[PDB]
Design a protein around this ligand. Sequence first.
Ligand SMILES: O=[N+]([O-])c1ccc(O)c2ncccc12
Length: 124
Amino acid sequence: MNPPPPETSNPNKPKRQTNQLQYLLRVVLKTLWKHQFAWPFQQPVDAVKLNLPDYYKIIKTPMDMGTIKKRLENNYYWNAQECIQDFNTMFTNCYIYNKPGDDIVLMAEALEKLFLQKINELPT
Ligand SMILES: O=[N+]([O-])c1ccc(O)c2ncccc12
């Protein structure tokens, strides 16, 4: 059984649009999305389909770029640091569940390095 996916809207949560959050969607996310290694991270981990019934026994704060993208489109975040923390949760979950050198980890590491390149300079 997969858990419910993380929320992409929350009426009790204050919304905001900043230049930096616009940039995270238009430039950072949408460029990472097109990377050849992006596909495992474009939706919540489907532990059933992948026959990983221990995934959500280990990973208790799941995150994926599909959730992040919908959050950005919904202005779910208050600032860019909130969105960047979601990215870092997604990368860290992959390194927690997997082992150095695994094909999936090499993919995550490729994206994380590109992610770090892209957020080195945010608009003002
Ligand atoms: O294919 N996947 O979606 C996937 C995503 C993230 C992960 O940490 C995975 N680990 C093992 C197998 C598939 C994984």
